[PDB]
């Protein structure tokens, strides 16, 4: 999983 | 995820966070919490602080962000901790 | 605005695009469209290719991204154009 | 608007 998806899942 | 209602809150970042946000082109002094989260995510990607293999791990011990949050690293999976750490560096308008 | 159905469409990036994705830690040959867009967005931020003042502007003439997209720059606002450029650099599984 | 929001709107 990309750092972009992880943060997107936090947003 | 942080609830929609908690992201529409108008906030004023404290000096250190404000410095961080402006270092990646943020313009203003007041933001929605959503906007703070956009620019902070952008910041982390831009400084390449995420671990290459396990990309939820953010290493900030040699970065402004580590001074801001007061931790050597954190996981993006820790939603509550990030919420808390961000809020210590904000004041609500 | 990629439709919900299109988000989960399984794709195989062509060599240049795959090289780009792996350069920021992607580690497989097969992805959803959503995942490609995640890593591509991440790439651009990691390489600092966006204009700081007007952050929809991406410069890529001297970057791998410019080679595979075939353009010197683009605007993130050009949704159709970007989708077209991305789809040129992958094969949709079972198409 | 951040590059992160523009790309987010593109997704």
Author numbering:
A (entry chain D), D (entry chain C): 17 to 27
B (entry chain B): 18 to 110
C (entry chain A): 18 to 112
From the reporting publication:
In malignancies with wild type p53 status, the activity of p53 is commonly attenuated through overexpression of Mdm2, a key negative regulator. Mdm2 both inhibits the transactivation function of p53 and selectively ubiquitinates p53, targeting it for proteosomal degradation. Binding is achieved by recapitulating interactions of three key p53 amino acid side chains (F19, W23, L26), with discrete pockets lining the hydrophobic cleft. We have previously described the mutations M62A and Q24R in the N-terminal domain of Mdm2 that impart Nutlin-resistance by selectively reducing affinity for Nutlin but not p53. Here, we present the three dimensional crystal structure of a stapled peptide antagonist bound to Nutlin-resistant mutant Mdm2.
